[PDB]
Write a protein that binds this ligand. Structure first.
Ligand SMILES: O=C(C1CCC1)N1C[C@@H]2C[C@H]3C[C@@H](O)[C@@H](O)[C@]2(C1)O3
Length: 130
């Protein structure tokens, strides 16, 4: 229905605004672009599904997310990719891991404060009907 297409349009507006707020935070610069294949040729042998905030915006605009739960699966993949590639005790790996945990926690805290639970449940029930 047109009412259902208006629901998904409001979801995309909400997701673009959360993603912009994460992308402008200086802590999260390292997550705003893909890990570059030239500079790190090893990366794509270890990490089988790369993800970053530029790819997330492109996915919003391609209508890949019908719920906030499917958006948070990609924010969780950004964070778990960084924990698995950079697991060592040295300061450069510990700094990346602390930033990855902060990007995940910050996304979940904005959603807990600003997403209406009945709006999410509506998106879930339209998705489950299709
Ligand atoms: O995992 C990441 C991203 C950082 C947030 C996630 N990288 C892997 C490389 C290791 C480290 C040092 C450079 O080699 C640079 O390319 C990366 C980027 O930083």
């Amino acid at each position: 229905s047109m009412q259902e297409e208006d629901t998904f349009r409001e979801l995309r507006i909400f997701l673009r605004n959360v993603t912009h707020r994460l992308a402008i935070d200086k802590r999260f610069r390292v997550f705003t672009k893909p890990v570059d294949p030239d500079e790190v040729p090893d990366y794509r042998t270890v990490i089988k599904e790369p993800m970053d905030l530029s790819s997330v915006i492109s996915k919003i605009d391609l209508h890949k997310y019908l719920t906030v739960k499917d958006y948070l699966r990609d924010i969780d993949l950004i964070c778990s990719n960084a924990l698995e590639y950079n697991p060592d005790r040295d300061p450069g790996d510990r700094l990346i891991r602390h930033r990855a945990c902060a990007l995940r926690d910050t996304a979940y805290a904005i959603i807990k404060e600003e997403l209406d639970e009945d709006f999410e449940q509506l998106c879930e029930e339209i998705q489950e009907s299709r």
